[PDB]
Amino acid sequence: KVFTKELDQWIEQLNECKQLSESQVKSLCEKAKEILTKESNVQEVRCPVTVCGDVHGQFHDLMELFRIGGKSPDTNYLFMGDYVNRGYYSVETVTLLVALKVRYRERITILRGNHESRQITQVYGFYDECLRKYGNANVWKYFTDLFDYLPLTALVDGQIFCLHGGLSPSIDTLDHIRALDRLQEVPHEGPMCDLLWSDPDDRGGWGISPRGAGYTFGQDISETFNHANGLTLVSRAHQLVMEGYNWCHDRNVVTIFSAPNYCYRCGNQAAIMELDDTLKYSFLQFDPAPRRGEPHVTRRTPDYFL
Amino acid sequence: XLXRXXX
Amino acid sequence: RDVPPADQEKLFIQKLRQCCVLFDFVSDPLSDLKWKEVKRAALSEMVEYITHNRNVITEPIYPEVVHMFAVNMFRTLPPSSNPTGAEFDPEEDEPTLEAAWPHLQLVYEFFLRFLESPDFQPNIAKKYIDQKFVLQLLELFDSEDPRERDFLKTTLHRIYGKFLGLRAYIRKQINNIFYRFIYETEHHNGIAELLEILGSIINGFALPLKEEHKIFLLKVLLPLHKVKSLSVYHPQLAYCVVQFLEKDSTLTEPVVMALLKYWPKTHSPKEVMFLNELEEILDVIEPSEFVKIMEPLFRQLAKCVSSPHFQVAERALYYWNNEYIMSLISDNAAKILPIMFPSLYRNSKTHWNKTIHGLIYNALKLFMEMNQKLFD
Amino acid sequence: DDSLYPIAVLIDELRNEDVQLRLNSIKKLSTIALALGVERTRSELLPFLTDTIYDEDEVLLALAEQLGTFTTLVGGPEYVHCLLPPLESLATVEETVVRDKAVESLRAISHEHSPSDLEAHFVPLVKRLAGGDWFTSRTSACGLFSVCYPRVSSAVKAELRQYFRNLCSDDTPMVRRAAASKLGEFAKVLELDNVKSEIIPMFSNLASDEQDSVRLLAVEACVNIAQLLPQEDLEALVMPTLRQAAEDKSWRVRYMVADKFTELQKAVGPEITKTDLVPAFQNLMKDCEAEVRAAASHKVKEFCENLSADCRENVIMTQILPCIKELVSDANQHVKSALASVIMGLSPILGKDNTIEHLLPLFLAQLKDECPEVRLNIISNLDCVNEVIGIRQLSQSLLPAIVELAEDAKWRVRLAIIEYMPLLAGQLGVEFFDEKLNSLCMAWLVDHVYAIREAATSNLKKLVEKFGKEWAHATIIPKVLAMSGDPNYLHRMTTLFCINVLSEVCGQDITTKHMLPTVLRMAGDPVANVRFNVAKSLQKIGPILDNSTLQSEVKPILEKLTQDQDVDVKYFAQEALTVLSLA
Ligand SMILES: [Mn+2]
Numbered sequence A: 001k002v003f004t005k006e007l008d009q010w011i012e013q014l015n016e017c018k019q020l021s022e023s024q025v026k027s028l029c030e031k032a033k034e035i036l037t038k039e040s041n042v043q044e045v046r047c048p049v050t051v052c053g054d055v056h057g058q059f060h061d062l063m064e065l066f067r068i069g070g071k072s073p074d075t076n077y078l079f080m081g082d083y084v085n086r087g088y089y090s091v092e093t094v095t096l097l098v099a100l101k102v103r104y105r106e107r108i109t110i111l112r113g114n115h116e117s118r119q120i121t122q123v124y125g126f127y128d129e130c131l132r133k134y135g136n137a138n139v140w141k142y143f144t145d146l147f148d149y150l151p152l153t154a155l156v157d158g159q160i161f162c163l164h165g166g167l168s169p170s171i172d173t174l175d176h177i178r179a180l181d182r183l184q185e186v187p188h189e190g191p192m193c194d195l196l197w198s199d200p201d202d203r204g205g206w207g208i209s210p211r212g213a214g215y216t217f218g219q220d221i222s223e224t225f226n227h228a229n230g231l232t233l234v235s236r237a238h239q240l241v242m243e244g245y246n247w248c249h250d251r252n253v254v255t256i257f258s259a260p261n262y263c264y265r266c267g268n269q270a271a272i273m274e275l276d277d278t279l280k281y282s283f284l285q286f287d288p289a290p291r292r293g294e295p296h297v298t299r300r301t302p303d304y305f306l
Numbered sequence B: 001x002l003x004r005x006x007x
Numbered sequence C: 001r002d003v004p005p006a007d008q009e010k011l012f013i014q015k016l017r018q019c020c021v022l023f024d025f026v027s028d029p030l031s032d033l034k035w036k037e038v039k040r041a042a043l044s045e046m047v048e049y050i051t052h053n054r055n056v057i058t059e060p061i062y063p064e065v066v067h068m069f070a071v072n073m074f075r076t077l078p079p080s081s082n083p084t085g086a087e088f089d090p091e092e093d094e095p096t097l098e099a100a101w102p103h104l105q106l107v108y109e110f111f112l113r114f115l116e117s118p119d120f121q122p123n124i125a126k127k128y129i130d131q132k133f134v135l136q137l138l139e140l141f142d143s144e145d146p147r148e149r150d151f152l153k154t155t156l157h158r159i160y161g162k163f164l165g166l167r168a169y170i171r172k173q174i175n176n177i178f179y180r181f182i183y184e185t186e187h188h189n190g191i192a193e194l195l196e197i198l199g200s201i202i203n204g205f206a207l208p209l210k211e212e213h214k215i216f217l218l219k220v221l222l223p224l225h226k227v228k229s230l231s232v233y234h235p236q237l238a239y240c241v242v243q244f245l246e247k248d249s250t251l252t253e254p255v256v257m258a259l260l261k262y263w264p265k266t267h268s269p270k271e272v273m274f275l276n277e278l279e280e281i282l283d284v285i286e287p288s289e290f291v292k293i294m295e296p297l298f299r300q301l302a303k304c305v306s307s308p309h310f311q312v313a314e315r316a317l318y319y320w321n322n323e324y325i326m327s328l329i330s331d332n333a334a335k336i337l338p339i340m341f342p343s344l345y346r347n348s349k350t351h352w353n354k355t356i357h358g359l360i361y362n363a364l365k366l367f368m369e370m371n372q373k374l375f376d
Numbered sequence D: 001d002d003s004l005y006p007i008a009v010l011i012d013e014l015r016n017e018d019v020q021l022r023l024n025s026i027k028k029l030s031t032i033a034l035a036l037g038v039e040r041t042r043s044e045l046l047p048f049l050t051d052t053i054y055d056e057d058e059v060l061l062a063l064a065e066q067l068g069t070f071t072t073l074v075g076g077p078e079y080v081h082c083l084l085p086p087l088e089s090l091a092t093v094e095e096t097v098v099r100d101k102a103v104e105s106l107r108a109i110s111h112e113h114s115p116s117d118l119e120a121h122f123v124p125l126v127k128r129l130a131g132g133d134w135f136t137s138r139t140s141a142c143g144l145f146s147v148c149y150p151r152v153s154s155a156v157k158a159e160l161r162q163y164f165r166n167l168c169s170d171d172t173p174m175v176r177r178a179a180a181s182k183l184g185e186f187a188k189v190l191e192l193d194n195v196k197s198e199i200i201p202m203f204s205n206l207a208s209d210e211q212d213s214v215r216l217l218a219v220e221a222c223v224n225i226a227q228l229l230p231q232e233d234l235e236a237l238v239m240p241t242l243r244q245a246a247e248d249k250s251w252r253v254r255y256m257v258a259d260k261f262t263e264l265q266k267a268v269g270p271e272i273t274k275t276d277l278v279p280a281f282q283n284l285m286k287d288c289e290a291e292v293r294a295a296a297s298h299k300v301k302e303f304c305e306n307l308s309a310d311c312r313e314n315v316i317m318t319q320i321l322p323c324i325k326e327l328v329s330d331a332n333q334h335v336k337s338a339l340a341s342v343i344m345g346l347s348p349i350l351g352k353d354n355t356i357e358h359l360l361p362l363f364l365a366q367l368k369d370e371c372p373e374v375r376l377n378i379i380s381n382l383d384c385v386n387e388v389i390g391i392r393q394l395s396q397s398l399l400p401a402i403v404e405l406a407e408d409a410k411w412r413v414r415l416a417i418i419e420y421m422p423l424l425a426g427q428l429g430v431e432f433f434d435e436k437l438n439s440l441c442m443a444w445l446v447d448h449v450y451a452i453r454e455a456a457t458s459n460l461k462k463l464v465e466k467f468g469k470e471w472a473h474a475t476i477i478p479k480v481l482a483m484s485g486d487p488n489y490l491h492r493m494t495t496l497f498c499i500n501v502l503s504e505v506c507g508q509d510i511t512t513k514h515m516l517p518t519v520l521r522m523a524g525d526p527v528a529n530v531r532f533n534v535a536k537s538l539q540k541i542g543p544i545l546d547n548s549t550l551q552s553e554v555k556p557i558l559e560k561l562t563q564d565q566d567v568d569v570k571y572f573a574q575e576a577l578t579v580l581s582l583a
């Protein structure tokens, strides 16, 4: 591998916020398109890991996340999904995290989120960001394809269930998810959708999601989904809580949210869940990183072709 | 609050 | 203001109260100083006093009213509480409300009712309703309190219609604001409310539409489409733009071309808007003029149809869903040659969103099932 | 008859269908004059691309970039006045990005004209732009005044001054804003008499423009006018105006004054500063708008740092300081935080005596502030109070409070104290440190946040650098070797982590017998992250070791690490073998 010396050169670069090129991405996404299709719907993940949630393009905060819980080879990772949308630097976030896959192929693990879709990606940030950062819908095209290959869920130590969204009435056995075909854009209905579009709540039973789609599910749903499946804990993101992490359903499910307060202009601390050697959980609550050249680019901004 | 697809 | 001390020696007190109700209570974001309830109650009675009694607005209160309003209203506006840049979306959020509204609500309300009185003689008032009065009133539309502008909208809209003299100055004045706006301050949070006014103003234009206003549409209104935050005020703009084309159809070529030059790349919600008002224009288009832009339009139009962004592609192709627009197309054959290739390479497979996939099919069907049975 | 290929063939782009096809033609206009005749360019090309391109503005932004570089590609100095027509048209375009460039292009090319060519071409160019039909023209000309002035005739100097006078008074606030901006720029093109004669009224007229968006732009330029050598000549010409701007009902002016308050000071002179700016500064710090006080506080040190002779200590003591002790306890979270950024530098100025009495009950107060960023700005500048105030008095008041912060909730705060430990525990802790602060300095290695472990690790190479070496072996290394047992791999990686940064300051003997026996004991750890960071760790601490005690001690460990589970252990133990040259 004389290509692997260029790869940590790519990574070295884009760790300073500067992005990768048109072709650099196309082949980065291709080399990650293939190192991914090997993984399964549920992806059995080795024990010591840090589990992260939604980062939504908040690059300089994703950096704050690494300053909080180690750098990317030296500390194992696992993301929920939702890298690309509400923030400013989506292109630089999803391109950093993917690079850190195809290089350190076991030192990180990236799951698919509701936002790793064509339709959401262009009804929120990403697509228009690619459009002003490249001039063509090509880097967007590549990233949306690599999105399809991202695994729908993960299984740490056969015990802690890591998925982006939540539970579905079209799943039962963990094996049901394994039987799905995820090599496609996320649909509006169906197990896949629910898997990465739904939330728990204080309601009991399945309920209707206030989100477009998915389902709400009470502490009864996950409890029984736990006690017959594997069952230490369900871990998810996708739904912000101001503590950064939130513990619900008689501690049957934690929600980990990993993007703090800016265009998540709400006011939340973000958090990560560290699963150690024996597999106990600690939670690190970080605030957003201090910024610079602050809110003023001195108002000399470029147009939008106009 | 920013819109419920979702603060 | 008491409407109790006979008829005369009553005008003597009203003027006393709107000097009384003019030593304004400079702090409402720091604690309390009540027994400034007097002020409130009193300018409340003054608001009652002028909307119930005949012949009360006599010559010597105009000055005293305008003084009262100006002393009360013409602040330096504060540093907008929400930090801003290019990063944050203009769906401007933390909507910091004016602290001292419980007095202002009335000051506005009164002065508006004053302006509205059946015996508000404007030939008397003009003397005291300065350009400089208008000017101040104007840099107030920059308030971030949505209530505040709502008042100014109607307030100025009255001052406009009431004073023919002011009208020239008013227009030129709210032009400069826009010029400040579009050519590099990109900030002002009242373009909406101002457009609403101008909406009515345009609608009240005349016999052979006067030159100044044609400029106003080309030099000012269309360029508004090119600012970052078109969303916040698009519908109102869209109105003003179509308004001209109702009155004078000969303006269609320049206003359609303008749009196509201001056509957005690298920002899609606007591209949708640009289509959304583009169709709004076609519904009012005169067949005569359709030709002049028929080509340059459907050239750009065809790029949208293909353009990967489904929201754009849908809205673009949904032209073929409305009878009049469709009439003009299939009243031509020059129309369906620029739109031949872009609905062929992006036709068979592609466009992941299968909605614009049957739409592009129904588009080609309604185009091939026209007079010219043409193939390639 | 020619064999090579350079001149002009390459492009299918001069006649265009798309946008980038045309754009790439003007981007590659850089080689169409050198490609074909530095003689015909003037003859045909320029009277062609005058204003013939008038479709899209993005083309015109590029063309302006070109007409700037065309300095020599048309003959040079003698033949530039043919560039003016395309750029004059380019200066009058609607969109500001185009015209803002066009001016900068025209600005650059004025210098390489001729005193007698400025008079006959460049200047009447300005005359029409400033004589513009509308504002886009006029806003542009405002720039082109300063360059062509000093070189032309004193009669045309008298013309230009009149034109610039006409723009400061322009019917529209847009131009005035522009004219107002380049006022300093222009007044700096000296004629002291005309600075007094004609600029001063311009200043005082704009300073009190009905638009607060113009007034503030006049203060910004005042600093120039008031820097152009009046004196008992400032109090009458350029003071009431400035003294007025301090009180301006617009905060946006009140702001501008403070954001420049030390500049004015440095321009206005110490004589006036004592009697006039002091009470203005005094007032600015007590402004209603917190954004002014903020910008006004961010300026206390620097204002104080250049005042006067004997008054310097007195003024700061008798009238500046009472404002600070009010500001440190201020409602706003950006004043305190700003004042913090500077207040520590106010110490050497007041000296040793007054600091202990008056500045101490302010660094302490500010240290334990509610806001995290306030203390972060105090802790950054502690060096300045440590250099000139006795270390014995440093430990009696601040130390107890510094130590409490060494365990603050915010890691950014913490890292600040750790950035500071060498100095604090070096200029003080002979034997004192390794008994009063040791178990505090070490506990950062067991922190839950990484960056602290990185700050705590980097801390040791310095904590053995300026400190001992046998004591490193006696305290630092004993507790660092201990750490290897921690069940969390994160934490037991800090064993290897400290090892490779505690090798460059501890040398062979300490490493070979004490550190290394743990490293090639750690290569058999269950978690691969410890295993590849042993191979990683062995590479770093390789050159430290003796050739023999790494050829048979640090070779069979690294070769067995190329032989199992991972792809990273099978790589760091590979590229460890390379650098160490062991294959
Ligand atoms: Mn999600």
Ligand SMILES: [Mn+2]
Pocket (backbone or CB within 6 Å): A054, A082, A114, A115, A237, A238, A239, B005, B006
């Ligand atoms: Mn989400």
